[PDB]
Design a protein around this ligand. Structure first.
Ligand SMILES: [K+]
Ligand SMILES: [K+]
Ligand SMILES: [K+]
Ligand SMILES: [K+]
Lengths: 466, 466, 466, 466
């Protein structure tokens, strides 16, 4: 495992403490053995997400201080429009309060736009993998969300360069099966979050776009982690070995028609989202019409001016290769610590999170007893670290049958915020999980004390099986 | 006209400049004679809105600096929950990125809640007056938005204590006409924005709530300007002459079951919103399920932690009577300056804006030529002040026929941000409009150069009728 | 009286409250009837100084946020050096923690430099009027402080353009009496603070510098309020009628060899100072040698990097003519309010403060009973406004006899911070003092309850004589 | 070598970059091979000092934001006064702009007070070791500064618990030789800076104070690094093994009569200083009289209110054992990396810096050619790290002879700022120096290109002898 030194220094700190074992036991009991119900004061290191918890630079805060809060025509709106033109070569922008706000703006408009001439009768969206909220807005608008990630992503511990790739064969298959008139849009997710933050290759993005243009299908780039995807393209594609990150980004967005972005991820913000449209002025006008009642007026879109200001600066900082090398390297360092201790992970590590295969850690716990959640709770009790379950607990029940949906994998996700924790915090996490190895065989599963009908993993209360 | 001195002093300033006469003329032409298309850099004093442009206190900024950005269980979420319990005596909160986000969370849930028992087949919402975004979400969910403000509000220049009151007779009539089973909810807007920021009396809120309870109807308090309403209740109701503002507020919310709030208004923020529910845990659970895809996880609701932190402090500051007396006194001062100069306005002035009857200023400009918009453009060209039209330009076309709906009044709204402008800025606005008297008779109407199908007053380009 | 509108709007506020009559009485009694002993929490509007109480801009705060805190070679040090070259055309800078820190750096160095040839055995400094701390450092190094302001400043109520002028006759007289060998330096104070903030004309500065060069005397520009002086020169000298403020500034500093500056005044800061030297590299080197033990290392000079950053931005903002017109106009407005009510003041008002002649308001109070202080205390009890005494209380006792020194004038100084208070705050001050007119004949003087030997006006406790 | 995890996470970052070797070669050559002349933009990691470069907490920034800038009676002055009473049990405080400002306030007052009683005819100061500015102010007032650190501090690599201790025998000898009437004050420096950040034991502080009280000598605690001293006392003295840091601090100040403190060190500030006096009201009054012309009025002392606010918060954070354990442990880790590679250092590492004996790394470079400066320059060219020389270059020439004084040790000081750099930055520093092992034998000395008469090490320009 190799540590990469920060290309920055610390300007401001925030205190975090390890509560005593007695407090953690009491807190987890109060949270119903569900860390999503823990208060942040009960948490030492928070690995729940990489969304909105990043550390900003002094330049970002300075931009916020001089932010323009005007209701219409904020100076920062035009800066943001110019920045999108510089980075992506797209001519239209609509700010949003965050990524799912951007999806709520654009996706219903794409459905209306596809239907306007009498198409989209059995409408579908096709993606390498839809993110959870992305797929939710697809389904809330009466559409089917189809995921066709490459098969290389399902062999978790076997290395591959582009585990986020579309399966090109399955893409052509779905176009023939559903017809180009029913495909509202193709969503290229970069990096592919649901495959574990694994990159999509430039040639895969190019081929997907060429297929979409011959069939007249609109392409949306889900761009939450477009800078981590660009770093991987430079690191693993020989064509871009000597390109700048910005040059990689510019080529990526030749292969889409628009983008939805959570600025809470790679742009290094705590809040914020963005819709950008390449050149389709009609979709831009329709998305503006939906933005006003849903998010706010079209020159701030549910963002404070100071947050559009921070987004302009963060979009620049998020492309800096030295930071990307350190950031993605820190995630790799945590993964390499676990792998060298025999802990099975998804390999290679993605850009923002390490995924630990808990099924191999607690084999005595069946899937319907949430093995990954048992390891997560054990991890919290031992260390104060809070992680999140990507497995049977998250997957939920089948709506028609009421049965536990089958999970292929029982993952514990260790999601790493940007510029927040040191490699010593990474060592603290690894040494905490490694120290559970003799106790894994003794862990018991979990059963429900309270289970809501939908979105159970957020608020359900569990209890240990004794 | 009486000036009220600030109960604060200035800690930080932001530079604004008056562009030269030619720069203002060039900018207005570039904006297509629509000030909504102006960049903020072409504006000296901005009166477009009182939303999100407020000046925070140093205590609010300090609260942001120590804000807890945690994804789940942020310390500021629990503070905000305690504050809602303190001010409103409500047990449940869901933060939202702003006011229309709060409505998108709650209003579709109230409909599904009403429809689940097999009724609400022709559902309606009843309000003293729906705000634009409120009515939009009502109609987007297939419901009719019914407005029943007291008739005293339509006599613009005639004083009344409570021009925002419900018409009780019309409320009982609509309950009988549609049936209590089709009324999803009653929305009490305080102050009543569309009546001009005019207050609702405590007895009116009480009678509305009592009528709604006799029919089992849910009551939502639209609370964007609830602190200005409480001040008016203390100023004009002898029952509360010796009550604190918080005591009036506490009584107000005995007459609702929940609230939606734009914190970009009276809570003195630049962004932020809030749903609070009194005690109906089922509606709270359903609104949380919708919050997740639409706004974010339920402990931040599309807000940065720092913005929840500022909201806790701003909710306190927004109730301070000395500030409220100054704020509303500054609005009254601008109105009295114009009224004493013979400019006809809505009287008494509301809590947040002055409305100027422009047809009496430019009678040679008929309503279909947008007389209020012509007055606004002239005000901009003389002074750099940007105001907004509440008249025929705003009212728009009938969607079925495509014809210009005619507005009964042609208002220019001078909307005043909180703690931003001095009474010297108020004199500058008044003196500019008063100085326009000899040029009012020479003003020309306006016609469309480009008219979009939707968002007409926002983006349409106009041209002078030569 | 004419109010001038702010060329800015408020971005952040700070709460101030008027304590009740009983609280003010208790606080003043607890402070021993000396407002210098009051805590700020007992003060509504603070008129004690215009030093370090200014409101900064958002650009100044943004500059602090990215300030470079490096011990040696801070980016902000070089920015400050370039700014001094741009404004003053001086080649060397040494930051200081504030103005008296800069005087402590330079004045002992100028004395040692003058002494190097065996002269200056009876050394003096000559100024139009030494500021208190300036005169203090002159005497701390064993020198005599000579003040020779024009006779026009002693006739308080008669208008003159340049009441801060040197008496050229007295300059040539003092040079002949003491000899150019004993004149360590001439200090040109702009504006002349002790004459009431009154400006020095360009021709007076030019004549003083030419007289000094023919005798080989060093000229130091005390530059605390150099921007207010430049505004007056443009306002009252037809030669500069069409010059920019920076052009006036540039000419002003052709007539000095170095400057000491408190940035807590015109550069709009809360802390900070500056020494700048035209081209004498020898004096610059000696001043650097003294800076290290007294203030800090020479690239920060007892300042935080963020404070050098704020000074660079504040030096720019302090020269803006629109701001200078508003600022000085607010001081004139306060003066005109009082003058139009029959309150005697020094006229015309200077750049930063109004001086009220209290001997004419309470003639029944002899000087040794502190008439101006009696008016100040009464003003505080009536309004919560805190002012400062420039009279017999400040002048102190004769060191030779121990008898009360005779004061020519008994002034109450109303010192106005920059961009902090509105003209409504000015009305509040004026109306409180005007409302005291019927009580002035009833006021009683003060005598000492506790008197320290030196600097009594800061900490002496007084009691009413009755 | 053991890494200790941060008891905090990063809230804001500051960009630093490693210039290429060609840029460093150009930058070092441009700076005349003296890193003190380098701009900070040429520096990646800055190890010049630990003064004023610390990273504040979000609570410290929030305290600044609500800081009270009042000229007299700032809320933060009284908070600071209460804090000094809480921590040290001292009843009087005088803020100062930084540590040498505090010494300029107090030390001339102690001399005048001693002379007022007919003593201090041949005045001296005695310390375990005077800091540079401390001794400078002693000599500026005509006194001799006597250093009597224990002999254990001169044995560089031999461990001892208390290498900052006073030599009691030399203390009693100096009292007899000079007489107690000539001892103006004893300065107890904690930690002992000039011994390398080495602690003073509680019993040593106690015995020194008891000796001083028997002779009527005033004791001043130079308290720049009093919290690092307190941690060492808890870490190494079994009597305080179970005491809190504050309890250790509270006992320490029973053994002094006053303190001078640079808050730019352990109180975690970028600027600021403090005088506190235990109970001698006369010394307090005299120090206030000197404070006014030298620093400012007595309720801010040359500090902005925001900086007194940060100092209150920083004094608390600086005492937190979890932070102190991490801070001092990070310094120990850098030392342990070097020791494990065979690099000779002073052992044990002090609280704030690592000292590398460069004579043993480059024995071919004699003392008059500055061997440590040669290692520093090579270290900068290899890595962008800037360190400072404590050897012949700093020691200077003998004033009587003008030849280079012989230095006992040629140290390179690696001074570590607080909460700024990670242990990965420590590895980067160590790995850079360790990678120089093959280049050490080839290194050439340095000779003067330009040498100033005083304080040459700040501004002298060197050239490689080759
Ligand atoms: K966040
Ligand atoms: K805003
Ligand atoms: K100040
Ligand atoms: K500093």
């Amino acid at each position: 495992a190799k540590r990469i030194v920060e290309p920055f220094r610390i300007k401001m700190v925030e205190k975090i403490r390890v509560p005593s074992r007695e407090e953690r036991e009491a807190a987890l009991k109060e949270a119903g053995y569900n860390p999503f119900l823990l208060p942040s004061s009960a948490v030492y290191i928070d690995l729940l997400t990489d969304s909105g918890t990043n550390a900003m630079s002094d330049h970002q805060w300075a931009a916020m201080i001089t932010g323009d809060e005007a209701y219409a025509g904020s100076r920062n709106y035009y800066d943001l429009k110019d920045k999108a033109k510089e980075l992506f070569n797209y001519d239209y922008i609509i700010p949003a309060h965050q990524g799912r706000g951007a999806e709520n703006i654009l996706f219903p408009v794409l459905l209306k736009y596809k239907q306007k001439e009498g198409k989209a009768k059995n409408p579908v969206f096709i993606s390498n993998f839809h993110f959870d909220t992305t797929a939710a807005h697809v389904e809330l608008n009466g559409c089917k969300a189809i995921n066709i990630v490459t098969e290389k992503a399902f062999d978790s511990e076997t290395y591959d360069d582009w585990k986020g790739d579309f399966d090109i064969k399955k893409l052509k298959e779905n176009i023939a099966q559903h017809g180009a008139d029913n495909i509202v849009a193709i969503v290229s997710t970069v990096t592919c979050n649901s495959a574990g933050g694994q990159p999509v290759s430039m040639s895969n993005l190019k081929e997907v776009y060429e297929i979409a243009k011959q069939h007249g299908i609109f392409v949306v780039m889900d761009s939450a982690r477009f800078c981590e995807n660009a770093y991987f393209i430079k690191a693993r594609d020989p064509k871009y070995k000597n390109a700048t990150i910005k040059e990689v980004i510019f080529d990526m967005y030749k292969y889409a028609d628009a983008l939805t972005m959570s600025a809470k991820k790679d742009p290094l913000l705590n809040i914020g989202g963005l819709v950008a449209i390449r050149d389709n002025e009609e979709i831009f006008t329709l998305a503006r019409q939906r933005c006003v009642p849903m998010e706010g007026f079209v020159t701030y879109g549910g963002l404070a001016g100071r947050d559009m200001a921070a987004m302009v600066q963060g979009l620049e900082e998020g492309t800096e290769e030295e930071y990307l090398h350190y950031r993605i390297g820190q995630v790799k360092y945590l993964g390499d610590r676990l792998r060298e201790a025999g802990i099975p992970i998804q390999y290679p590590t993605g850009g923002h999170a390490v995924f630990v295969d808990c099924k191999k850690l607690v084999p005595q716990i069946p899937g319907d007893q949430f093995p990954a959640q048992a390891v997560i709770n054990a991890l919290y009790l031992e260390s104060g670290v809070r992680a999140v379950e990507i497995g049977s607990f998250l997957l939920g029940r089948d709506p028609a049958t009421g049965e536990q949906k089958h999970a292929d994998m029982e993952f514990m996700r260790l999601t790493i915020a940007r510029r927040v924790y040191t490699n010593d915090h990474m060592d603290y996490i690894a040494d905490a999980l490694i120290g559970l190895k003799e106790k894994f065989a003794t862990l018991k599963g979990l059963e429900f004390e309270y289970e809501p009908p939908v979105l159970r993993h957020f608020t359900a209360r569990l209890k240990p099986i004794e």
